[PDB]
Write a protein that binds this ligand. Structure first.
Ligand code: NA
Ligand code: NA
Ligand code: NA
Ligand code: NA
Ligand code: NA
Ligand code: NA
Lengths: 251, 251
């Protein structure tokens, strides 16, 4: 599996001027090894990112709606994104599931519409503190993945990347270890193998989407079932290239 | 009060090419009388709209988040919008309150943050079918407006426009009359007068945000408390200019 790093800017930076400075920095970074790099940014900066970002990397939306267009004030759709030549979207980020109240049925419909319309997706999942504390992580995560599975059209698993977020370690007073990340990525891979088969499970990139920094990326990358990262705050920083380059420690 | 027409493209068109064709059409329209025209478009088309739209009209976002930036994957913020020179946002559209589950507390926080950060807002309200059928429209609408009121900083009412949407007439099998529109705009004006005073009530533009087409805009515009329109589907059509030009029938 080709190591995969997505840089999620989230709702940052504040200005188009800062977004352009950041793009210029990414454009000069020397990448080592072999890695697929995708950069996700706010809708408003997506045109400038598509125009100016280095051509060997790909741009991604941070969300899309379920419909092609229509009476959905405030929403951006797949055709709009695609009309810019943009090929990726993130779906189901914890921040959207939590703050914006996106449920599994909403997200399943997004994944289905996105893939049926030629998009590639980074589909996020992960359990909260009570399920982690109860030792029920795999069950929670399996239910999410089981909702996702029927959305994927035949022949589209090559266009699917799954990111595991240890939500239990986000603003809870608890931290995730390197072993935690390996364990949950493996859980996901096994759920896929059981449900859709080993060939698909062996090809789908599963990413660690907890806290990833220059000080932990090489050890994380080395876990056998960790195929890359959905990077939060470090994507805004020159340390993002350390993370991209951690691929040389993954085998 | 200067007549005010906002063109809400909603989640349309599907492509940047269509958005550019539409902008070129708007750019050639001959405006009559005196009217303040604002055009709201999907986040992804906002840069091209700001760049290319006629300078005597203003661009608007269709939504914004409550925060300046941060861990809010998928969301666009006021500073981002402002970094393009964009001055307006719509807030609280029925489609967002309904489909995207935006509640009054969320919307109040958006209005407060937006205005405190120099934005001008088009704040939407309106009652559903059961409150219309029960004859309880004014009470429902008053409660919405009463939630909005504390969000408006001192000296910012000049940066506030209110749009009334007859949600009871949207996909319900019921249609709104011209008299309905006048009556509810007046209801809103009176709530403002009672709560914040006649000087403010006499200056705030209150818009009809139900179905507005070339075949009803002149009669609607002529209602004394209707100060303009938040236009849906006709904003995508050459008929939008008829609606903009209906200002000559308002006094
Ligand atoms: Na267990
Ligand atoms: Na395929
Ligand atoms: Na690995
Ligand atoms: Na009554
Ligand atoms: Na003012
Ligand atoms: Na009028």
């Amino acid at each position: 599996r080709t190591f995969f790093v997505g840089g999620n800017w989230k709702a940052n930076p504040k200005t188009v001027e800062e977004a352009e400075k950041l793009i210029e920095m990414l454009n000069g970074a020397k990448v080592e090894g072999n890695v697929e790099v995708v950069v996700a940014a706010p809708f408003l900066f997506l045109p400038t990112l598509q125009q100016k970002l280095r051509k060997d990397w790909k741009v991604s939306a941070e969300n899309v709606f379920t419909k092609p267009n229509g009476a959905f004030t405030g929403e951006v759709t797949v055709p709009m994104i695609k009309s810019f030549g943009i090929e990726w979207t993130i779906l189901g980020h914890s921040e959207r599931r939590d703050i914006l109240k996106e449920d599994d049925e909403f997200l399943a419909a997004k994944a289905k519409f996105a893939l049926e319309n030629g998009m590639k997706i980074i589909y996020c999942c992960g359990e909260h503190l009570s399920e982690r504390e109860a030792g029920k992580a795999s069950e929670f995560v399996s239910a999410q993945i089981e909702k996702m599975i029927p959305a994927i059209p035949a022949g589209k698993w090559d266009d699917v990347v799954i990111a595991y977020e240890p939500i239990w370690a986000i603003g809870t007073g608890k931290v995730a270890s390197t072993q935690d990340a390996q364990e949950m990525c493996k859980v996901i891979r096994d759920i896929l193998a059981a449900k859709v088969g080993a060939d698909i499970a062996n090809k789908v990139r599963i990413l660690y989407g907890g806290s990833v920094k220059p000080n932990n990326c090489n050890e994380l990358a080395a876990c056998p079932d960790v195929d890359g990262f959905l990077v939060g705050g470090a994507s805004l920083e020159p340390g993002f290239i350390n993370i991209v380059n951690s691929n040389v420690h993954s085998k």
